[PDB]
Amino acid sequence: LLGVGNGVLSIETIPAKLINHFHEHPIHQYTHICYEPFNPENPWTKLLLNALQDIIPELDARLWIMFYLSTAIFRGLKLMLLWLGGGCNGKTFLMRLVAMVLGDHYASKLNISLLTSFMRLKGRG
Amino acid sequence: DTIQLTAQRKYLAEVQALETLLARELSVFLTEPGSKKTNIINRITGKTYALPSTELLRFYEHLEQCRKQGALMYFLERQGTYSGLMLDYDLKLNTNAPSLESSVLSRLCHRIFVHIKNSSVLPEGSHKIHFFFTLKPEAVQGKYGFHVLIPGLKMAASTKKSIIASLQHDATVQKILHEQGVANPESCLDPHSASVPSLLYGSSKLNHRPYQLKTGFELVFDSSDPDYIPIHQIKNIESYNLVSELSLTNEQGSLVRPVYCSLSILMLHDPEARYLHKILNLLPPEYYVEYPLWSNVVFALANTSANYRPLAEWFSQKCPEKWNTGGKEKLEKLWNDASRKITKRSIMYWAHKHAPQQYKEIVEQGYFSILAEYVYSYNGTLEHYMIAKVIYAMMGNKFVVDVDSNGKYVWFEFVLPGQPMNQGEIWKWRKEVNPDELHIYISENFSRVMDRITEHIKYHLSQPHETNILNYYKKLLKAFERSKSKIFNDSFKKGVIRQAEFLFRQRSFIQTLDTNPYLLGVGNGVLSIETIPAKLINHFHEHPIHQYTHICYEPFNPENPWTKLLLNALQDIIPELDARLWIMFYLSTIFRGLKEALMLLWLGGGCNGKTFLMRLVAMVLGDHSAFMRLKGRGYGYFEETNKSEILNTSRLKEMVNTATMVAASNYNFIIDTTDHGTWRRLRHYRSKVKFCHNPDPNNSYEKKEDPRFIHEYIMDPNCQNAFFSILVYFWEKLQKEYNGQIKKVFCPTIESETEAYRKSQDTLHRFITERVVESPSAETVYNLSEVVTAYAEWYNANINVKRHIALELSQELENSVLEKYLQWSPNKTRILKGCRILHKFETLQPGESYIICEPKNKWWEWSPNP
């Protein structure tokens, strides 16, 4: 269960059901990113599908990465990725977009100084 | 006029019994308005009822119980086609009251019965017909009236219209009234009497006294053989249920016998909406004819409450000219826009601005009313929450409470001119440890309302009532006197404040405080940079602004001597037009929002103004573990540099990923970074002017020094005022020219200086500029290892003998300016495409290449060149 701007998002069953009424689920954490049903005809939807395919044209790699990043919405038992890039390659845009879409409650910034030389990952997805 | 009905419904049992009856078991008979089934109208509540006779009897007897004690009611009954007969006689008086003697009334009854016996349906046989004469308590402004009620007769509406038409031109009644001081006895009978619904006996109109039954006559008519009508008087009329007897539609009368011949809704059931309707009338007419004002008013109404639509038409209906011509869809579009910033505080502000005395009277009456129902509803015992409610209604526009990070309630106040205050805090929100203003206010201003309710109680005590009402009011006065002094008690005052901490609570206030970067707090008010030209706000507004600066703000005045000398000093510091404009445009971005990272390294020889301006820029705009010092600031630079001008660490790049940061130094830097991303957001400038006691006339780099600049003008407020005006002027110029984008500013001198300084500081930048030349005709393809070897040779033969490593060179080049030049080869390798690399000491081939605003006296004005 995830707290979003317009309610509580449940990933128990496919398709996901939005809880926008009275319920007895004990949900307290939330993020400002509202959820809407997937519209492939939405201009912003297709604009992002275009941007994602431009960043990673290679379909196996794109599908694997976007499936891997689709696990960010799941905050239970879970692989570490080392994705390289010279710069202005679209990785910073997508990683910042993931951070903002998941929120500070669910997503956290990690500093490379810690690994080179812990509690901020508490219950994060 | 609501206090007495509240109190009459507070100390008149019969009234409370009637209220319980009507609210509980007469409520099932509610009828939608306009239904033909409705027989009773309640003006006050506005609710319509359809009572069957079985409950109508109890209704009428409850009213009669209520009426005998003098309680005021405003009821009505709807008489339809077939009901009793009602005559209205608004007698006009030459001198302000006719006697209406009993013998005269007998004459009038005999003449109206002649016209009823004439020209009519009447049942055959012997029958009883009753007449009643209710008279006005007193003639007002020489205007008297009395009524004739005939509940016994039952005829159609047209038959009543025929009867009243025949009475209108009757000379007998008119000449009877000629000596009665009746100016026009002809025009006294209202024809609409047979159609307009009649008020029940004992009821009356707003601020009108009910009619009093002077006497009631009874007549016996025998259609079998009329010989003489025996007009006599009804005995013991007082021992009867007069409301039940005199009802036109009643059929169960003991003596009277049947002889068979929306914006309004919203204001009603919403007292505070009714308050808003009362106060909106104070607006001058321009507010609904001028779009800007009407749109703002409806935008505030919609934002505060979405159910105020009918009121929105009503205010729009104040001008039928624009309301009928396009008003409907304009209002709908405005409502849709608002539903998809301004509240009633602005509306009260405007009302106080335009109609002060009416505003004061309206608000005082509202406060009196509110604390009055609190007084009556609890028999004169006042507790903390009631006082809190009255205070919140009274000062809902000056104090705000919100929970800070410590979980403690925090008080905020909007500062108004004329009260003690720290300088530069006007028209802004200040944090208060304790709400001292409320603590004084409850003792001082509130006691006025308490005295108002005290003087009202004494008034009702003086007026003639029965004994029980007097005993009630004596007890109420005693209780209110006991409860009156508590508002000065410290514990009571503290409890009231704690209780009001919940009403005044406005959620999300602290997180919205000073959030908008397009507003600045200044000494004389709040500065706005939303649009050009800049505007200074020194009036009431809903902007949540707490932080401020001590600089007063004035519009750009070129003729100002301080502005003139400031412009000349600025020209002296940076003689070049392009450099001066670049520095001033950059220094003018006070902006507390999203700012770029054009990290500027301002060099100079000292006593050039760079150090002077470095401290000077801090004074004009100050506040807007070292990393956290940039949170919320809009600018800020460092100074006082030693020879040890190296970058702070490997973390020296981490401080520039919402304030403009500029590096000022006595010498060129030791920073020496090795990436093109790093160097692209870095700028360099070195001062050329020298300020000295004896400037060289032949040297433009030497000018007369002004030691008075550094110790008196900087402490002179007007200097900072002019500096702030100059800064906001240059800011407006930048956004009106380049849409606010600083990369669009042309800086050939500064760009050249930065290029040269980078050539000095980075060995990779030097190699690119010296040995890498773009060449489309160069068919040679240069690979990663080849570039590494060429750079190694260049470093060895020009810089120093050193053993290089290809691993770092590959990354350094892939993250260099050659990122687009090092295109991917078919083997994924990094190769040089469309460009050439020089070998040992060659030169560029033909066609290859290495990889104006002139000073004016009015330089601060517009520049023709983009």
Automatic annotation (TrEMBL), chain A:
Mg(2+) binds at T92. Belongs to the asfivirus helicase C962R family. This is Putative primase C962R.
